[PDB]
Design a protein around this ligand. Structure first.
Ligand SMILES: Nc1ncnc2c1ncn2[C@@H]1O[C@H](CSCC[C@H](N)C(=O)O)[C@@H](O)[C@H]1O
Ligand SMILES: Nc1ncnc2c1ncn2[C@@H]1O[C@H](CSCC[C@H](N)C(=O)O)[C@@H](O)[C@H]1O
Lengths: 203, 199
């Protein structure tokens, strides 16, 4: 159901924390990590994700069925590409329309590689583009949101968010995260396990 | 979130494969394995389940919040106990009604111990009982079904099942099973070998 195009070279601690959280919230059978470098083997995947059962592949969108027997084929118009630049928000009623939710992004910098657009250009008949509100989200937030709209059938504007949360570490260090986050029951922003400590040590 | 009451002594390969499948399909965040023996420690929990991030506890329903502060409080009427002898079938619109779905069963045998009744009795105000069809399901199938009804909002009679499938190896399973796209019953990874090995 959820397909993440791996958006970096190697795996930083940050992306390991995100992917870990995603895995524990959707379950390993429901996430495919795709488009990894062609040379990638098991020894290249962080063992923390392997233990959690991460399904990964070097293949791309059209080729993933070749790597997984259980995966229903990719039909035209039933694959939703998620893009903050799209004009139509994802709706609860879309639960019927899509069998796959794809996350692209921007790979690297200097130059950057807009994978979202390249996908859009590679799969003109496959992809439908949808937005998750007018603010930028992290991958685990974007997935949590997709899951809230599609599985819990809650419309976007009924979801409680916080934008640009500020985290205070000491009397000196005040950092602000330039993203929208889903609130938890106690009114605080949901981050992956370990993310907070990671942000702290960055200061 | 799903709460599974651990319904056998120790961990057989059978239940390990069943629990693994569940964890991979719903996510380890969304499952609590409860009511384990008081002596139980992490050392007694199978490694394959710990790697997948199994959340387990010796506690029962009343004390589940104590072990996991991230969980929403259990409120009366918002906890559904899944019971094949119950009267009202679980329906898609119940997705707004419940925060928890509990799976009990029989801690047999000689004598057996019906945890389903024990629960239903120890927590009368807490629990509401729902059925998943008139046939018996494995826990992984019952969770799979609860998920289709609650998360995908698919009605029970619109789910495609197979009743009492036979498996030839050169065996009939007395359960109802959900079908996959390929028309075959959906079993936990590794279960077919274990069924075969037993023959
Ligand atoms: N508001 C929004 N609407 C739709 N998708 C969004 C979104 N905010 C984030 N996303 C998803 O999350 C992804 C960005 S997270 C990508 C991080 C990567 N290291 C990079 O540099 O780009 C996007 O590809 C998109 O799929
Ligand atoms: N048709 C049905 N309707 C509602 N719940 C069901 C069901 N079939 C199975 N379940 C639930 O799924 C669980 C798995 S059966 C558990 C196995 C255990 N050895 C025992 O005999 O009890 C059961 O506890 C039951 O409560």
């Amino acid at each position: 159901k959820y397909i993440i195009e791996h958006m970096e070279e190697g795996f930083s601690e940050w992306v390991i924390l995100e992917y870990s959280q995603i895995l524990r919230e959707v379950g390993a059978e429901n996430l495919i990590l795709s488009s990894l470098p062609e040379s990638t083997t098991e020894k290249d995947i962080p063992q923390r994700l392997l233990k959690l059962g991460l399904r990964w592949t070097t293949k791309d969108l059209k080729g993933i069925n070749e790597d997984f027997k259980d995966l229903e084929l990719l039909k035209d118009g039933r694959v939703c590409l998620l893009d903050p630049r799209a004009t139509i928000d994802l709706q609860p009623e879309d639960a019927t329309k899509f069998d796959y939710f794809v996350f692209g992004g921007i790979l690297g910098d200097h130059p950057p590689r807009d994978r979202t657009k390249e996908l859009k250009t590679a799969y003109p008949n496959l992809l439908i583009s949808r937005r998750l509100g007018d603010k930028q989200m992290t991958t685990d937030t974007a997935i949590r949101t997709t899951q809230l709209i599609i599985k819990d059938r809650i419309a976007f504007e009924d979801i409680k968010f916080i934008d640009y949360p500020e985290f205070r570490f000491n009397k000196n260090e005040a950092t602000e995260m330039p993203f929208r986050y889903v609130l938890d029951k106690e009114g605080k922003p949901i981050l992956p396990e370990g993310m907070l400590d990671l942000i702290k040590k960055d200061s």
